[PDB]
Write a protein that binds this ligand. Structure first.
Ligand SMILES: NC(=O)C1=CN([C@@H]2O[C@H](COP(=O)(O)OP(=O)(O)OC[C@H]3O[C@@H](n4cnc5c(N)ncnc54)[C@H](OP(=O)(O)O)[C@@H]3O)[C@@H](O)[C@H]2O)C=CC1
Ligand SMILES: NC(=O)C1=CN([C@@H]2O[C@H](COP(=O)(O)OP(=O)(O)OC[C@H]3O[C@@H](n4cnc5c(N)ncnc54)[C@H](OP(=O)(O)O)[C@@H]3O)[C@@H](O)[C@H]2O)C=CC1
Lengths: 193, 193
């Protein structure tokens, strides 16, 4: 089971052009929104989270309860959390593609012989790095996308391609949740199959 | 410039189910069709061809005039052509993704220090391995897809996902060529932007 779990904020540039804010430095364009974080935890519960190196680095520390697999260039130093934590498993892009495309891979701890099997029965959530998300979409069983809307502009250093959201909209939407976070913020979490 | 150049044959299984034949062992489901091979050469002319390991192995020898880049697991032996030829450059999936997603990578010859730059101005054709094709589609500038139709069933060991062809059909078709190859064979080459 492969689930995509990500968020974005449709916003405007200083000149009024549209853009889909995805990342802001080592954080999020909309900052820290309680409901957003709560939804994330519920959606990733009981799954093995897969993310890119910068996504792992953006974490203040390991998220409790879930295994963190990081896809990165192993020829470089291991990426760590803001608190210095290492991931449970680090895999190459080749392993990542072999897995999401329907294969099975063996993952091993970073500084230990321990290794286990990640196959098509494993429950996985792909969360960070548009590259990882775009690569997994054709093989995903479920897509959980959140749209955070702010009254005023939000900045970003990483954006999402509108074509990506378009490809997702082709899928069957089966669930949608809308929340008035505050006077200038709304959050919509939608589930596609 | 990223161009996808691939072919398939919409056929039926022994029980009448539909399937998109893509590969047959180390060859093609429809065998060797002159026009198909001629089209391939014209479409890959002046470009750097990128393919997976088995695709490289399916080649009787290096295709004259074009650089062959093979994306594979470098922890394994170098894949060679049916004639024993090595590719001009071998890169990892990480390098492949970094490139197609908009980056720049440095490629080096297999058994020599030589290395060069592959960037967004390079002219590339992604041809073999559905995994490579699915990964490049969201970043492609052009898609050249050929549909070979045989009167009678063709076998295959590798197939294409109908969703892939569906995603392509969303693009603007700008060219289409249909040929009556023979009494039981037709070939349609279509170009999407
Ligand atoms: N749902 C959401 O909205 C989410 C947003 N984010 C946000 O995403 C942004 C990060 O996006 P993005 O960069 O695409 O993320 P990825 O995790 O996809 O990519 C991380 C990058 O870091 C580099 N890298 C590769 N290997 C290593 C290594 N071993 N050590 C250190 N660095 C390495 C590479 O650099 P290079 O580019 O040079 O090849 C790679 O492109 C952040 O702002 C984060 O807050 C994160 C999760 C979810
Ligand atoms: N347009 C078309 O219709 C085209 C069709 N083809 C056909 O495609 C078929 C091959 O498809 P596919 O297998 O998806 O192709 P790819 O080239 O995508 O994959 C080759 C595979 O070979 C393995 N491999 C990885 N690294 C190495 C290595 N270093 N040495 C040896 N093997 C390695 C892997 O095995 P593993 O699965 O174990 O991870 C990988 O999955 C063929 O039948 C070919 O004729 C080829 C080009 C074009």
């Amino acid at each position: 089971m492969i689930k995509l779990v990500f968020r974005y904020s449709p916003t405007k540039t200083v000149d009024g052009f549209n853009e889909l804010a995805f990342g802001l430095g080592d954080g999020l364009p909309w900052g820290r929104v309680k409901k957003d974080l709560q939804n994330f935890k519920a959606r990733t519960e009981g799954t093995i989270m897969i993310m890119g190196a910068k996504t792992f680095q953006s974490l203040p520390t390991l998220l409790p309860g879930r295994s963190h697999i990081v896809v990165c260039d192993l020829a470089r130093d291991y990426p760590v959390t803001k608190d210095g934590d290492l991931a449970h498993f680090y895999i190459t892009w080749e392993q990542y593609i072999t897995y999401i495309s329907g294969g099975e891979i063996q993952v091993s701890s970073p500084n230990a012989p321990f290794e286990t099997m990640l196959d098509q029965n494993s429950k996985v959530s792909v969360i960070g790095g548009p590259a990882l998300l775009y690569a997994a979409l054709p093989y995903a069983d479920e897509v959980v996308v959140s749209r955070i809307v702010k009254r005023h502009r939000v900045n970003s250093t990483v954006q999402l391609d509108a074509s990506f959201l378009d490809d997702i909209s082709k899928r069957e939407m089966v669930e949608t949740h809308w929340y008035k976070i505050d006077e200038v913020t709304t959050l919509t979490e939608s589930v596609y199959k």
